[PDB]
């Protein structure tokens, strides 16, 4: 090879069971710590001091209800480093202050960088074009917008999502009641790219499996394929005719088809990320002003849009006192919005 | 041949620009009826008393909606599951007030979409294809049946069917959360895994094939020109793609068999979405999401809230506000 | 006066026109409600 | 309904400007030597 750099490069790039690479130095420790931090906190760590919640198997939560929760609102956007001014190197206190939250979020963010550098490094060694890394920018845009930008626009990390199954459900419902996030056209484009991607995943897998060439005698058809074979395993011509006649249009170009499969979900995730950057500032699509002006003056005018804001108002009033404990909300029974009987 | 024979030959022709077929003989008129009624109602229908309490909700563009707020509104709670065709009404004006168009549209649409599924089997047989594309479409179709027919049947009313509109859809979602805690239901969780994983594997597959396309073009041309419709040779190197992906994760985590790969691509979203559909269709009979409300209790008996209890508080907000003039008694039992 | 050898013809095939008109019109159908507000 | 008065022109140009961009590019592609 040459010098130590090149000998290191050699060893880093050995063909082994788990490829390492230069990216591996960033990826492996960050991914390991993000994951271990999650399993550690969900197994053993409370959120009593930060949220007033139990959040670990140790306290009696189940896989659905455990989380590594965000720090208290009074922590602001502290990095909350183990050795920082809040925990001052006390591991126990750091855990009770929500230090595992920023630990997981930040190692996780570096780990994703390392993962995408991995996709670039392996593509370059194998001699393929780096579209997989490019597609992975959509996961990165989502993670960064939702777990970093969103809480950075708000008052504190407290309002970032907590790392847990039920905790994320809570995050969805908060976004509905407070941001009317379903109304937002960047979320709608996200939903279209997710459901349209799942649609393309299903329809392309089914079409290939149902236009296969008979390439063996088996009635189980998976053996009748060879990775090295020159020939297409299924008939593009027959698949094109089928869909042209069923749906009116069909793919005819396999290259376009597969690029479109990258395009749709990647673009949808990027659109959802932009809407979340706006929500960081409470810059919501909350209302249609023309609807409100009409409904304010005309008490007989009702749409599904006015119905949903009534639901939001219930969500805010009923959930806020427990969900936002630092606010010390006390909402006397008489002020809570409720319809008849319920 | 005779007229009938020639007719059959035409109906089943593999040569029609759009395949007709016997399923198509039912599909064409029913889809046309649902489409025409839908477009006209979405533009021009007057307000509909969805909850049967003489509180009509405006769905249409001309009555003060936009594309996002507009809907064809479900039929009246007074109707329930009763069949309400136009001829059951005293007038079109009554039919409109009571949400007749909703029933007309959804019944024609469900029948037509079920025939769309049959037609997919039909053409595959005419073309000498394997037959299961229609099984993949059963997943979205099951989901449409769940929200427009099974759920209303369980709850005793088409007024609880999903509205035909963008904001109406969100209304249905939010009320469904209050009433069933769907997020905490494992079948909806499998549906999320199905659609997020479908998106993920869609992007993954698109990117892996795109990354290994064989050089056939110059830097000025779109690489798409490197593939010609109907060519025999595969247009990318799967051994190269597997070589990449097997190293990204580990060798045995990657497919080198395209048939297994494409089966997985079909199966993962279709199965997840079947569980989504069965989630709605079984919450239709009020077998609901997990309830861990007050599950964690300290040594004295104080309730120690978990994230489940915070969900519960958001659910309570939805519950107490929804259909704010329709409940007279303390329990919402359907 | 001398020709620039870097010039290249541009293309948009029919499918691309249809895909692009669909994108634009559907984006307009989605965003127009917000523009009217 | 009291809509934003600029909604109409914003919507019109949003459609027209890029649609016409595409049409210009399509037609001159078709007119190139068969």
């Amino acid at each position: 090879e040459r010098g130590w750099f090149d000998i290191l490069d050699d060893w880093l790039k050995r063909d082994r069971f788990v490829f390492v690479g230069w990216s591996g130095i960033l990826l492996f420790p960050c991914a390991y710590l993000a994951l271990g931090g999650w399993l550690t906190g969900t197994t053993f760590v409370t959120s009593w001091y930060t949220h007033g919640l139990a959040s670990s198997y140790l306290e009696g939560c189940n896989f659905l209800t455990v989380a590594v929760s965000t720090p208290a609102n009074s922590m602001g956007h502290s990095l909350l480093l183990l050795w920082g001014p809040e925990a001052q190197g006390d591991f126990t206190r750091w855990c009770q202050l929500g230090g595992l939250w920023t630990f997981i979020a930040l190692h996780g963010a570096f780990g994703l960088i390392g993962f995408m550098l991995r996709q670039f490094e392996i593509a370059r060694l194998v001699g393929v074009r780096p579209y997989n890394a490019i597609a992975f920018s959509a996961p990165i845009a989502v993670f960064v917008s939702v777990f970093l930008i969103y809480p950075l626009g708000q008052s504190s990390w407290f309002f970032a999502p907590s790392f847990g199954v039920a905790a994320i459900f809570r995050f969805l419902l908060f976004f509905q009641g407070f941001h009317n996030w379903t109304l937002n056209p960047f979320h709608m484009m996200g939903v279209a790219g997710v459901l349209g991607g799942a649609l393309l995943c299903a329809i392309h897998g089914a079409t290939v499996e149902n236009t296969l060439f008979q390439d063996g005698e088996g009635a189980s058809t998976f053996r009748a394929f060879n990775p090295t074979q020159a020939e297409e395993t299924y008939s593009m011509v027959t698949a094109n005719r089928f869909w042209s006649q069923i749906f009116g249009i069909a793919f005819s170009n396999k290259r376009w088809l597969h690029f479109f499969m990258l395009f749709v979900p990647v673009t949808g995730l990027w659109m959802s990320a932009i809407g979340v950057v706006g929500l960081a500032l409470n810059l919501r699509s909350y209302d249609f002003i023309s609807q409100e002006i009409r409904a304010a003056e005309d008490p007989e005018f009702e749409t599904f849009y006015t119905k949903n804001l009534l639901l939001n108002e219930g969500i805010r009033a009923w959930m806020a006192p427990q969900d936002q404990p630092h606010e010390n909300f006390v909402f006397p029974e008489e002020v809570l919005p409720r319809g008849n009987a319920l | 041949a005779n007229l009938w024979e020639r007719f059959c030959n035409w109906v089943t022709s593999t040569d029609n620009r759009l395949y007709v077929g016997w399923f198509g003989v039912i599909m064409i008129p029913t889809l046309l009826a649902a489409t025409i009624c839908f477009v006209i109602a979405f533009i021009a229908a007057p307000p509909v008393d969805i909850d049967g309490i003489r509180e009509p909700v405006s769905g249409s563009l001309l009555y003060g909606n936009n594309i996002i707020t507009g809907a064809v509104v479900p039929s009246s709670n007074a109707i329930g599951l009763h069949f309400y065709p136009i001829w059951e009404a005293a007038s079109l004006d009554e039919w409109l007030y009571n949400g007749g168009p909703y029933q007309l549209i959804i019944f024609h649409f469900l029948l037509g979409a079920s025939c769309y599924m049959g037609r997919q089997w039909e053409l595959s047989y005419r073309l000498g294809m394997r037959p299961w594309i229609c099984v993949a479409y059963s997943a979205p179709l099951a989901s449409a049946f769940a929200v427009f027919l099974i759920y209303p049947i369980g709850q005793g009313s088409f007024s609880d069917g999903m509205p035909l509109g963008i904001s109406g859809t969100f209304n249905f979602m939010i009320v469904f959360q209050a009433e069933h805690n769907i997020l905490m239901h494992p079948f909806h969780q499998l549906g999320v895994a199905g659609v997020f994983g479908g998106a993920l594997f869609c992007a993954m597959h698109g990117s892996l094939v795109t990354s290994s396309l064989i050089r056939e073009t110059t830097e000025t041309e779109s690489a798409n020109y490197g593939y010609k419709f109907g060519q025999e040779e595969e247009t990318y190197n799967i051994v190269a793609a597997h070589g990449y992906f097997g190293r990204l994760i580990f060798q045995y985590a990657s497919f080198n068999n395209s048939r297994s790969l494409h089966f997985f691509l079909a199966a993962w979203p279709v199965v997840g979405v079947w569980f989504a559909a069965l989630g709605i269709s079984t919450m239709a009979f009020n077998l609901n999401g997990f309830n861990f409300n007050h599950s964690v209790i300290d040594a004295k008996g104080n309730v120690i809230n978990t994230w489940a209890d915070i969900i519960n508080r958001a659910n309570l907000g939805m519950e107490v506000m929804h259909e704010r003039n329709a409940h007279n008694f303390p329990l919402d039992l359907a | 006066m001398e020709p620039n050898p870097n010039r290249q013809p541009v293309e948009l095939n029919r499918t691309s026109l249809y895909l692009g008109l669909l994108l634009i019109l559907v984006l307009a159908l989605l965003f127009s409600s917000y523009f009217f507000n | 309904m009291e809509v934003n008065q600029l909604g109409l022109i914003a919507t019109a140009l949003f459609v027209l400007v890029p649609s016409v961009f595409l049409i210009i590019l399509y037609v001159q592609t078709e007119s190139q030597q068969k």
């Binding site: 009116g248 069909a250 | 533009i43 419709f229 | 249809y18 307009a28 409600s33 | 919507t11 019109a12």
Partner: peptide, 30 residues
């Protein structure tokens, strides 16, 4: 004016469906 705009965009899309199906670039083998 808004109803007109929304219905106009919709009508353009249905027209587009018609041209994209019946006046597509026809697929040609090889």
């Amino acid at each position: 004016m808004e109803t007109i705009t929304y219905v106009f965009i919709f009508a353009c899309i249905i027209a587009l469906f018609f041209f994209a199906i019946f006046f597509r670039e026809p697929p040609r083998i090889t």
